[PDB]
Write a protein that binds this ligand. Sequence first.
Ligand SMILES: NC(=O)C1=CN([C@@H]2O[C@H](COP(=O)(O)OP(=O)(O)OC[C@H]3O[C@@H](n4cnc5c(N)ncnc54)[C@H](OP(=O)(O)O)[C@@H]3O)[C@@H](O)[C@H]2O)C=CC1
Ligand SMILES: NC(=O)C1=CN([C@@H]2O[C@H](COP(=O)(O)OP(=O)(O)OC[C@H]3O[C@@H](n4cnc5c(N)ncnc54)[C@H](OP(=O)(O)O)[C@@H]3O)[C@@H](O)[C@H]2O)C=CC1
Lengths: 257, 257
Amino acid sequence: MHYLPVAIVTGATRGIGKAICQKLFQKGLSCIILGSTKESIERTAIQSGLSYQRQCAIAIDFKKWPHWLDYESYDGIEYFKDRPPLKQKYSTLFDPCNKWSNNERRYYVNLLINCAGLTQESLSVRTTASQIQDIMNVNFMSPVTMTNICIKYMMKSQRRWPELSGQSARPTIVNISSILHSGKMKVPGTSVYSASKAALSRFTEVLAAEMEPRNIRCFTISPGLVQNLPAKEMLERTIGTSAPAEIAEEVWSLYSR
Amino acid sequence: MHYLPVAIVTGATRGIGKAICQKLFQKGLSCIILGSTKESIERTAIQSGLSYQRQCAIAIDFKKWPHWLDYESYDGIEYFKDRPPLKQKYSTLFDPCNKWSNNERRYYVNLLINCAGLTQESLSVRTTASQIQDIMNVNFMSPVTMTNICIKYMMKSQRRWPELSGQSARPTIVNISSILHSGKMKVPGTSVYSASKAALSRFTEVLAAEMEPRNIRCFTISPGLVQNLPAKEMLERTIGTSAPAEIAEEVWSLYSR
Ligand SMILES: NC(=O)C1=CN([C@@H]2O[C@H](COP(=O)(O)OP(=O)(O)OC[C@H]3O[C@@H](n4cnc5c(N)ncnc54)[C@H](OP(=O)(O)O)[C@@H]3O)[C@@H](O)[C@H]2O)C=CC1
Ligand SMILES: NC(=O)C1=CN([C@@H]2O[C@H](COP(=O)(O)OP(=O)(O)OC[C@H]3O[C@@H](n4cnc5c(N)ncnc54)[C@H](OP(=O)(O)O)[C@@H]3O)[C@@H](O)[C@H]2O)C=CC1
């Protein structure tokens, strides 16, 4: 049997998540990309790799947490180099792996990147309750559920295909935190954004302590540049930067090395 | 006019929040205490101070975030030294102040303690979605809304009673964070608990940067002892402590000095 690693990358329709995905594909993994709508994943779907490499996109709105855990199917699209996009309906996040696998080949998820992110540009007292709900559902609650759904999958896959150990990278989770999550960079306009980033970082550090003995690696990356503007320009000017290409490379570093 | 400071203390029906409240009353403030149910606030309602000092309790279930923002009234009880508890219905959190104020006296909130807390004792992968929702709604979302409702109140009160400056403590918010929110203490079983504490801490640090120039002081306190048990006993034994009496004192220190 040939086991072929797949990565799930949330927030991959554009920005940092798009860089990360390009790297991973360049480096030999198949990709399952997440976007928020049918429209945004149709947009990404319009890159030459090994013949067995595959790419698809799934539409999940992270604001709709926790209801999206219970959707029977998800709208998805498989896309290609030199062949038009294919409408799909996937029963789970791992359904694309099932459909790619054949008598000779087993596709399986071995890497999850939580990169989907919603921003904030308003003072705490001027930020509504639903805005705070959206930010936490996209930046924290959903990433937690993604992480947990994947860890269940990763552990069960490890028990059922024991040969994977020593012939694979260890199942890896990488959550994208922000420089704003701690220290000097306390930027007005971003109180709940930063907190959600603080939550994701801290969740991952504690998860890593739970997971490391079970041989799932859990990392966080903490980047910070391209907002503004979110009072705030005074600190953002007073005080470094990050490239999406640089972050994609660090993600690969963490997985491969 | 005599302006008389009132404190709102969430999570004050027992534990640390009860210590904090006793201190504040000992030190001359009137108290509005929060509990989660009609029953728990009835329980607290069954302490000799100045004649003008007052105490009441209000029932708000922090799991019901964000719906509790919209309740028309809240069940409350006013209690006394040597006089039986009085059933109340309060239109807002500041309604008790309105009812205590008289031609000679003005009661107003000048201190908010977010001390209400829900714990976690399960591994991430073994913690359901609703459990994670409860923890974040009680430990983070609700405290954020409390903080914002109070800051609106505090700013408007400052504009309408300008004499308060120089004759008062500055309007103060104290959020109770936990040693678990950062650093060495990464305890299995507590991933979302710790994250919510991380979120509250970080939110408050950024809020303080927003608020300090508007003359609202925003502090966090980070205590850590009495859980267990939440794998976990190995770290909790390997590595200090905090007394509720010690924390009550630190809260008073922060407000008075
Ligand atoms: N910009 C910066 O300087 C820094 C950013 N970061 C973080 O890195 C991450 C990458 O984003 P960034 O590179 O900045 O570029 P973008 O913010 O432009 O990318 C945002 C991504 O989030 C997805 N998303 C937004 N809303 C939802 C939703 N409701 N449900 C599901 N997915 C959603 C988007 O999908 P869709 O296309 O469908 O909208 C999109 O893929 C973020 O988490 C961000 O906070 C960290 C440090 C610095
Ligand atoms: N225990 C420890 O060692 C440490 C605790 N802390 C933190 O300090 C805080 C104080 O709690 P603690 O002293 O430990 O004692 P308790 O946990 O026994 O007190 C819990 C309080 O939270 C309130 N609460 C629980 N659920 C809800 C809800 N759904 N809605 C509104 N209120 C609710 C309770 O009200 P009710 O009576 O109605 O249930 C109660 O007043 C917590 O935030 C905690 O995380 C920090 C460091 C260490």
